[PDB]
Structures are given as C-alpha cells and as structure tokens.
Design a protein around this ligand. Structure first.
Ligand SMILES: [Mg+2]
Ligand SMILES: [Mg+2]
Ligand SMILES: [Mg+2]
Ligand SMILES: [Mg+2]
Ligand SMILES: [Mg+2]
Ligand SMILES: [Mg+2]
Ligand SMILES: [Mg+2]
Ligand SMILES: [Mg+2]
Ligand SMILES: [Mg+2]
Ligand SMILES: [Mg+2]
Ligand SMILES: [Mg+2]
Ligand SMILES: [Mg+2]
Ligand SMILES: [Mg+2]
Ligand SMILES: [Mg+2]
Ligand SMILES: [Mg+2]
Ligand SMILES: [Mg+2]
Ligand SMILES: [Mg+2]
Ligand SMILES: [Mg+2]
Ligand SMILES: [Mg+2]
Ligand SMILES: [Mg+2]
Ligand SMILES: [Mg+2]
Ligand SMILES: [Mg+2]
Ligand SMILES: [Mg+2]
Ligand SMILES: [Mg+2]
Ligand SMILES: [Mg+2]
Ligand SMILES: [Mg+2]
Ligand SMILES: [Mg+2]
Ligand SMILES: [Mg+2]
Ligand SMILES: [Mg+2]
Ligand SMILES: [Mg+2]
Ligand SMILES: [Mg+2]
Ligand SMILES: [Mg+2]
Ligand SMILES: [Mg+2]
Ligand SMILES: [Mg+2]
Ligand SMILES: [Mg+2]
Ligand SMILES: [Mg+2]
Ligand SMILES: [Mg+2]
Ligand SMILES: [Mg+2]
Ligand SMILES: [Mg+2]
Ligand SMILES: [Mg+2]
Ligand SMILES: [Mg+2]
Ligand SMILES: [Mg+2]
Ligand SMILES: [Mg+2]
Ligand SMILES: [Mg+2]
Ligand SMILES: [Mg+2]
Ligand SMILES: [Mg+2]
Ligand SMILES: [Mg+2]
Ligand SMILES: [Mg+2]
Ligand SMILES: [Mg+2]
Ligand SMILES: [Mg+2]
Ligand SMILES: [Mg+2]
Ligand SMILES: [Mg+2]
Ligand SMILES: [Mg+2]
Ligand SMILES: [Mg+2]
Ligand SMILES: [Mg+2]
Ligand SMILES: [Mg+2]
Ligand SMILES: [Mg+2]
Ligand SMILES: [Zn+2]
Lengths: 65, 71
RNA sequence: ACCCACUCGGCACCUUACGAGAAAUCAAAGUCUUUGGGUUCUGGGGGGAGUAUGGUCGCAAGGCUGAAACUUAAAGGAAUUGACGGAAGGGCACCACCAGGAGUGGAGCCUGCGGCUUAAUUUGACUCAACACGGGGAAACUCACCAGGUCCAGACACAAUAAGGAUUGACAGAUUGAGAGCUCUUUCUUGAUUUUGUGGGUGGUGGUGCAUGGCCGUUCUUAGUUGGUGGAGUGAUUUGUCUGCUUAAUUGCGAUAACGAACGAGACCUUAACCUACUAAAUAGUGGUGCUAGCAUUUGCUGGUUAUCCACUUCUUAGAGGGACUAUCGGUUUCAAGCCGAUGGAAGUUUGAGGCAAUAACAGGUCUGUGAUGCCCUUAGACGUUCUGGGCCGCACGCGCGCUACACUGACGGAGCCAGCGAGUCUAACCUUGGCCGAGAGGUCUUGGUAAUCUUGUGAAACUCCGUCGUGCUGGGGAUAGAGCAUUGUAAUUAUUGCUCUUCAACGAGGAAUUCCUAGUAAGCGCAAGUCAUCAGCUUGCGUUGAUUACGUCCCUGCCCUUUGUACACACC
C-alpha cells in the first residue's frame, strides 16, 4: 500500500565480479514517528488517550468571583 | 554456423609504388635549375605541387584530384 | 435365574505415571552408575550369507549344525519438519458449474503459429502460464536472413620497414548495380598521423536464460509468515496458528495451556460519485445593462455583439474542508462476530474501479532493451560496419486471435442530431479552422494554437424521423478482378494508403466441441491515444445506447485446506 511510498526506500545495484554478477537489493524502513513532512504514523495506528482517575462526590456547593 | 566457401580469387590492396622520385627538375652546368613538369594555378597549391603527365591529361594530385589543366 | 458387597484365580480394557525408555510407548519395558533374588537362551557394524565345507536327519523337497577370503562408512531404530500420492473429509471461484446473454467452432477476408516452398523466406516462445505475444502494423531503414560491393572506427606496448620516403589521396579510362581510385592502367600528390609482425585489445541482434544481474510471468480471483512471556518435549519441535461459526480475508466471534503482538489482509493511496457551505475566475460560465437583427406586436419570443459597463459562482475548473460509520428500526443467528429486510441517504456488493502488496517456489520468459554481465565463439576472404538489391508477405494444406456477414428490430436515401478520455510546430513544419477550385480522393490561398485561449461544442457512430425497396443469394453480402485518378515517400512492381466506375464469390444462423460474462455490467456503437513519412481489421483507454438471467451450489473442472502413508528431502522430472 501507500505507506510503502511514504516509509521505505529501496535500491537495486548490480555488482560485477570475476565470476558473474550479483544483485544487491537494499530496503530501509524509516521511523514514521519522526516523519517530519508527512504522516507521523501508519494508517494502522490507533492511540487511545488515557482518561484520569476521578475523585468525585463533594456534595454540591458553588464558587463566587 | 556453416563456415567457408570461395569460387576463389582474394582481393589485394595497393602499394604507393616505389620511386626515388623528385629527380624531376634539372640543373645545368653550375648551377642554374630548371623545373620539368608544370605546376598548379590553384590558390590552395602554391606552385610547389606539380601536374602528372598522362595523355590529354595534365593533373593536380595535391588538389586530391581537383582540376583538369590540359596542354 | 436375577441384584448388591466381598474374595481367590482368568481373558482383557480404562485413567494415571511416583518410575523407565532413543523415542513410539510400557503395571512392566518399574523397583539400574544409589549398578547383585534364581535360572535358561541369543546378539556384538553392514555386506559376503544362512552362502562354502564337513557331520547328521529325510524317499524327496529339504531340516539341524555352519565358516572364511574379500568388500564396505555406514547400514539400522524412533520421532520431527517438509515435499509428494492413481487414500479419506472438508471448503473456495462465471479464467467452475447452475439460470441465461453474447458468441467463437461452419463462410469471405484480416492477422499470428505450424507446415511446405525458398538464394533467403532472420528469430524467440508451444497446456492454463506459446500463436493481434516480443509493444513484432518489416517497401529503404528497422534487420538479425539471402546475392554481392566498400571501410577499420584493428586502443595501447615492443619489434620491423623507413626521410634517399613509413604512409595518404585522385582526375580520365578500364572496371562496377553505382559519379566506390574496389581493383587495374598512368604518375602526380601526401610526410611519419600510417604500414607489417607478434602481444594485447575492440565490436558483434554470434552461442549459452542450464553460467548470472535486472525486469517480468506463474503459483495467487491466494491467505499466508514470525517473534516475546507462559505450557509440552532430552531433542529437531510443538502449543499460540483450533472442532465450530463467520468473512473477500489467520476477517472476526467463540472454544481454549495459552496471553499479548508484529509482516501480509485490512488500514493507506488514486480515480468515479455528493456539497445553492469556503476561497476565486476575459484561458470556465450565468443573470442585468447598454449596441443591435428577426418575428409579433400589448408586455413578449429567438439570436448577434473575448470587454461597452455592473453584479454573481447554480452549472465548469481545483484548493481547503465536510460526508458514511453497512447509520435508524426490525427480523435472524450460540441472541457472539455476523447475515437479511425496511426507511432514510450522493452514496450502504471491500461504496464502484484500480495502485501498492509478506514468506517461499520455477532450472517459466528475457543475454534480441541496455556501454548490465561470466564463459565460449568470431575479429579483415569479419559473425565489426556500411552501401545496392531481395527476403521476413513466398502457398496443395493443419491450428489460434480477429473483422464483415447471411438481412425487413434491415439495407439504401433524404432529414433529425448528441459524447467522453486524448494530442499537437524551435530553432520547426505538428494540431489545423476559414476562402476558393475539384464528383471524389485531394489541391490552393490564407489563418488561430507551445493551448481550459486555437483545431474543438472534436455537430463520433450506433440512434431518432419521412421516404424507396418487399422477401426474391433481393436493393442482404461485398470476396475476387479490370480500368482511371490522387496522397506519403529518394523509392509504391509482389499492387502502403485514399477515391471513381465496373466485376457481385462464399455465406440461407453454422457438427463434435469451446470462450466470456452479474449492472450503467453484458452486448451493440463509434472516438482519442500508442505504433506512425505513409499504413489498424491490433492494443490501451474513453464516452454513447443499454438488456435477459443467477444472488445459488459442488455436478463438471481448477485450486487451497485438514486427516493419512512414505524407504522421498536434488523432495514423484
Ligand atoms: Mg492494502
Ligand atoms: Mg615528381
Ligand atoms: Mg510422558
Ligand atoms: Mg511409574
Ligand atoms: Mg490394576
Ligand atoms: Mg557382525
Ligand atoms: Mg560368498
Ligand atoms: Mg555334507
Ligand atoms: Mg545336508
Ligand atoms: Mg519313503
Ligand atoms: Mg543355524
Ligand atoms: Mg549346509
Ligand atoms: Mg568386516
Ligand atoms: Mg511424516
Ligand atoms: Mg451454463
Ligand atoms: Mg451455443
Ligand atoms: Mg536471428
Ligand atoms: Mg492461471
Ligand atoms: Mg539493407
Ligand atoms: Mg569508405
Ligand atoms: Mg595487431
Ligand atoms: Mg591475437
Ligand atoms: Mg550485444
Ligand atoms: Mg530461467
Ligand atoms: Mg534470471
Ligand atoms: Mg534456447
Ligand atoms: Mg469473480
Ligand atoms: Mg494450522
Ligand atoms: Mg510457527
Ligand atoms: Mg484474498
Ligand atoms: Mg407593455
Ligand atoms: Mg414592449
Ligand atoms: Mg460551485
Ligand atoms: Mg432507498
Ligand atoms: Mg474509494
Ligand atoms: Mg536482459
Ligand atoms: Mg554476449
Ligand atoms: Mg529496447
Ligand atoms: Mg540496467
Ligand atoms: Mg555477429
Ligand atoms: Mg512476421
Ligand atoms: Mg496454432
Ligand atoms: Mg492472445
Ligand atoms: Mg440511415
Ligand atoms: Mg474534375
Ligand atoms: Mg503561426
Ligand atoms: Mg466536450
Ligand atoms: Mg439466397
Ligand atoms: Mg450492399
Ligand atoms: Mg510493391
Ligand atoms: Mg514477396
Ligand atoms: Mg446481389
Ligand atoms: Mg447463430
Ligand atoms: Mg507498413
Ligand atoms: Mg491511429
Ligand atoms: Mg501489434
Ligand atoms: Mg505404514
Ligand atoms: Zn591543384
């Protein structure tokens, strides 16, 4: 998919030797968190903000200013 | 593949012949020098270059061929 | 006779496993390096071989006893994971079938393949996954093939020749297809650039895709791959990754010695749909106004006018947003994931269609895309290259993709008259409107455009309407062939293509077979783009007209999955 275009660089290189040639194929996948100028995460990613304990009750009452 | 055939007769090349040449020019009894063979009135060939003597034919070789002066 | 409890001794099963084992497994195969209850028998790597020999028993066939030489690095056991089967159980799919549509298979031609022919008819590829494929529509070129002619563009090093010239070129004639000084005659020219030899290079559409890279196709219209902590196992391993249900999906639910995750699917991206909300526009358009034509006249109706001005953004353009999450409701389901129906909605089949796409495999195709490349071959009487000419088109015939037809839901003739995706000329001749001339093809003079500006509203074709014909190989059909005219091109003969007249074939719905397809789809219909000097019956996209039939299954076929067997693991070639 699309994240491929966004996050992985590839290169093929032909390395000519005494016997024949070999194909080097390099693939690098870069930290998307660091994206900088694009999307900062995979389309996959789904973060939930973590609530907060509450200490409720305290029967009514009102503040004045 | 197939290899070879030939109803024969291979073609050769050329030679530039021999000739200890430019004897042509003649100097009299000490020491006046007269040119044999006439030279070229083309601006390109400042009259050092001569004309070969055939028949009808006098011809400038320096002009790689160029021009047909006839006397 | 039957039931309950007990107990000796039987044939067995069940669950455990403290314990054993290399494991499979085992209440003995336990009580074994913490090694001793009694006793009997047999084995000491594989083959050679239960062979030779002697003894013995037998009527015999044979039985018992039973060697060595020599050969050899493994043979063997159990389990694991793969791979594979002409074993079994499940699934998925219009490259499967059901219900059907439109066909192909029959005909004419077009075009590839075989075959034959040939100087040559260059060549790759042969089930799906070779054959309108190599973007492969070849007149030269391309081009590799064939008949023949030039050239070196043979780096460099050493040696040799050699300034008394190493070498170079050529006018005319001869030659030659040729205005190739190819060679020859002849005799000027040139000046250390070459020549000759060896060494070494260099080019090659020469060989090897079974030496390679890269790319691509296929498996795959598939759903699979892995690691952390836990559990099992001495171990390779396994569980997680599973009976079921569910999904297009190892997509999920659920079950659960597993829990929680990552690659792949999904997400993501592109394009088609919806925004009287946002920002705008003489390279897009609308309303008002002026200038103005025509028809009515009573306002009116229908046009002209890239700026005569004013305002707008519904339509067009493209930025930014918004929108859908199978929403609401209800059926159904283990009331789970889901599935179904109704309403709403631009939109509810993964929204439609694509792009991307893991792990692994193949001796799939490509050395003929590459100045990617190993090795082999070849290298001046070239397999380098170029030039002239022919050839890839050759035709008893087999095969594939196609085009056009057999007519009356039609052909012909008037007339109506509507798309979308494209593309176009600088140091050049591309897209072409308009005016004339021409039956046509085309010609000619001008013209706008490097483009939302001009071609172009690309006035496309099927289609619609009024006529002619009237079922007759007919006015359906347009093969084959003759004559003439033009266009591209240096060149049109074997006829590039276009036009006119004439000639008027087979084909009366196509055997056995076989392809493709579920909605703006199928089928019909044209167009633009690729190729392109010229040539589309091909492709790639595009819009126009627009259905019948399923919404299911495992019968055929194909494939994945379990279970199972394996003496395979280079893995059933
Ligand atoms: Mg995806
Ligand atoms: Mg002289
Ligand atoms: Mg056990
Ligand atoms: Mg035990
Ligand atoms: Mg017991
Ligand atoms: Mg032994
Ligand atoms: Mg023996
Ligand atoms: Mg005996
Ligand atoms: Mg005996
Ligand atoms: Mg007897
Ligand atoms: Mg014995
Ligand atoms: Mg014996
Ligand atoms: Mg031995
Ligand atoms: Mg096994
Ligand atoms: Mg059927
Ligand atoms: Mg049929
Ligand atoms: Mg060839
Ligand atoms: Mg296939
Ligand atoms: Mg040629
Ligand atoms: Mg030459
Ligand atoms: Mg040499
Ligand atoms: Mg050599
Ligand atoms: Mg080559
Ligand atoms: Mg291969
Ligand atoms: Mg390869
Ligand atoms: Mg081959
Ligand atoms: Mg399908
Ligand atoms: Mg499994
Ligand atoms: Mg695993
Ligand atoms: Mg799938
Ligand atoms: Mg009025
Ligand atoms: Mg009025
Ligand atoms: Mg708008
Ligand atoms: Mg509705
Ligand atoms: Mg979409
Ligand atoms: Mg290649
Ligand atoms: Mg080669
Ligand atoms: Mg190429
Ligand atoms: Mg390359
Ligand atoms: Mg060659
Ligand atoms: Mg051909
Ligand atoms: Mg064939
Ligand atoms: Mg095909
Ligand atoms: Mg008509
Ligand atoms: Mg005329
Ligand atoms: Mg102009
Ligand atoms: Mg338009
Ligand atoms: Mg008839
Ligand atoms: Mg007709
Ligand atoms: Mg011709
Ligand atoms: Mg021919
Ligand atoms: Mg007729
Ligand atoms: Mg029919
Ligand atoms: Mg052509
Ligand atoms: Mg075209
Ligand atoms: Mg083609
Ligand atoms: Mg067995
Ligand atoms: Zn001269």
């Amino acid at each position: 998919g699309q994240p491929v275009n966004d996050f992985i660089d590839t290169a093929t290189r032909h390395v000519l030797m005494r016997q024949g040639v070999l194909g080097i194929k390099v693939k690098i996948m870069r930290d998307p968190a660091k994206s900088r100028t694009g999307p900062k995460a995979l389309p996959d990613a789904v973060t939930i903000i973590e609530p907060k304990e509450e200490e409720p009750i305290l029967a009514p009452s009102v503040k004045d200013y | 593949x197939x290899x070879x055939x030939x109803x024969x007769x291979x073609x050769x090349x050329x030679x530039x012949x021999x000739x200890x040449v430019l004897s042509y020019y003649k100097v009299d009894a000490e020491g006046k020098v007269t040119k044999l063979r006439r030279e070229c009135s083309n601006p390109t060939c400042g009259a050092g270059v001569f004309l070969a003597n055939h028949k009808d034919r006098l011809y400038c070789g320096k002009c790689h061929s160029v021009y047909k002066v006839n006397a």
